[PDB]
């Protein structure tokens, strides 16, 4: 295997992944084509350029000692390899809710600012992609330090996972489970972005003089880049700068070993002490796993960006694209009412699994989307118009009973139409999970596509219920709530 063939393949890969989107009908075929080239490149390379002699747990003591010398908490918990979530933190003593049990000073963190002062600093000053995107900057920062045997962050790097469950690691037949869903397009883009970035930075590393001292100039495999971006996207966090004037992306050692459960954010940055602080989300008895709340992310974001599917995700949602048609005779008025309300004429909204399926901004859009001309004028003219705009995203104050009946009728029909665009039904997906033995990555994809349909199904039911409530208030001639 010659370095000339590898650069030929990366050159071919960069041209393929820089081409414009071949249309949504050819994205699956574009995906499989890109996969074929990446696997060819990957089969002619040696995997991870830097590998460590020990098992993952052999390095946790060095991580603990390294974090103690720099002022982090190391007492009260231990690293356990849990079956369900992988490695995590387990409490060695009772920990009461709201107790500050974990803190990490800024010296230990890997940040975009620490990448600027690293060997990657010179190349950072020349490449616009690095400067505009800190996530990629962190990824290459992690790589250069991984290949530096005397890096300050070596104790943390040697404890990272060696593989992930992001879609970048799925087999073709595992991703195939997602055909006809909303989620699969983000899988396509993630794979195409990653391949293009690897090939683009493979050539950048070989052409820029500022990259001559990088360890990546000696070796930089596709497996290196996939591991680094998966490490960043599953773990990274946003913290303030030391100035406090702005934000930056960071890897937080020790803290990032906690796994996810439902709850609230209990991790904040203490600018005075210049350290990350985390208080207990709930009571943790000794011998119980210590969890944190990652954030209010859907299961699609958890699968694609965090590499897992969370059962009982209370913040799950699906996307829905809506817009006011240019062929509508009331387009001008509707766009104007939307503009005065701070709502675009077309947008991607969210349907939630929550008690109301739609947010205040979606409710306001649908109300204007179904307004008569006389209703639009009352939102555009007179001393009461701005007061009408104010209540548009409020379910307690409808425009009229008829406007509500029309908007919930539309939403019931659109969500039903969306359900009919999937290859499978809900009952079919349940039978697959019940009657087949599947890998973890396969179950993620199937549960992902199941969750999309169940959110749409529930939105159909809640839209039908809401249609009947407001149709009742109309036939009974109930007075409209005001102000």
């Amino acid at each position: 295997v010659s370095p000339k063939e590898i650069l030929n393949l990366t050159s071919e890969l960069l041209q393929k992944c820089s081409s414009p989107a071949p249309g949504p009908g050819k994205e699956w075929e574009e995906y499989v084509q890109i996969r074929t080239l990446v696997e060819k490149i990957r089969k002619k390379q040696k995997g991870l350029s830097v590998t460590f002699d020990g098992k993952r747990e052999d390095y946790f003591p060095d991580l603990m000692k390294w974090a103690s010398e720099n002022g982090a908490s190391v007492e009260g918990f231990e690293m356990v390899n849990f079956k369900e979530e992988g490695f995590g933190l387990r409490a060695t003593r009772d920990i009461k809710a709201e107790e500050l049990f974990l803190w990490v000073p800024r010296k230990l963190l890997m940040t975009v600012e620490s990448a600027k002062n690293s060997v990657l600093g010179p190349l950072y000053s020349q490449d616009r992609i690095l400067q505009a995107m800190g996530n990629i900057a962190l990824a290459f920062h992690l790589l250069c330090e991984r290949a530096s045997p005397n890096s300050f962050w070596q104790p943390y790097i040697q404890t990272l996972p060696s593989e992930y469950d992001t879609p970048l690691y799925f087999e073709e037949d595992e991703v195939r489970y997602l055909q006809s869903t909303q989620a699969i397009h983000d899988v396509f883009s993630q794979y195409k972005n990653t391949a293009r970035q690897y090939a683009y930075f493979y050539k950048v590393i070989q052409t820029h003089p500022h990259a001559n001292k990088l360890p990546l100039k000696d070796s930089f495999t596709y497996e290196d880049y996939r591991w680094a971006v998966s490490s960043v996207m599953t773990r990274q966090a946003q913290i303030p700068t030391e100035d406090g004037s702005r934000v930056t992306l960071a890897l937080i050692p020790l803290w990032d070993m906690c796994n996810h459960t439902n709850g609230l954010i209990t991790t904040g940055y203490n600018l005075e002490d210049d350290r990350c602080e985390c208080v207990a989300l709930q009571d943790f008895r000794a011998g119980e796993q210590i969890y944190i709340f990652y954030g209010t992310r859907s299961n699609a974001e958890f699968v694609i960006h965090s590499g897992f599917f969370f059962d009982n995700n209370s913040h799950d949602r699906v996307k829905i694209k809506l817009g006011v048609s240019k062929s509508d005779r009331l387009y001008a008025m509707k766009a104007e009412v939307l503009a005065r309300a701070g709502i675009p004429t077309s947008s991607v909204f969210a349907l939630h699994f929550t008690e109301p399926p739609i947010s205040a901004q979606l409710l306001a859009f649908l109300r204007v989307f179904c307004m008569t001309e006389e209703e639009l004028k009352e939102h555009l003219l007179g001393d009461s118009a701005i007061d009408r705009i104010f209540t548009l995203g409020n379910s307690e104050f409808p425009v009229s009973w008829d406007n509500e009946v029309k908007l919930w009728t539309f939403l019931e029909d659109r969500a039903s139409l969306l359900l009919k665009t999937y290859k499978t039904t809900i009952e079919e997906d349940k039978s697959v999970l019940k009657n087949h033995d599947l890998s973890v990555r396969a179950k993620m994809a199937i549960k992902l596509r199941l969750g999309e349909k169940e959110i749409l199904e529930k939105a159909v039911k809640s839209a039908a219920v809401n249609r009947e409530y407001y149709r009742q208030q109309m036939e009974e001639k109930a007075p409209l709530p005001k102000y």
């Binding site: 995107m133 996207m233 991790t267």
Partner: peptide
Amino acid sequence: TLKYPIEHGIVTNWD
């Protein structure tokens, strides 16, 4: 509440 709440695995744009 917290001045700087920290999100584990904050979703960023990759392109």
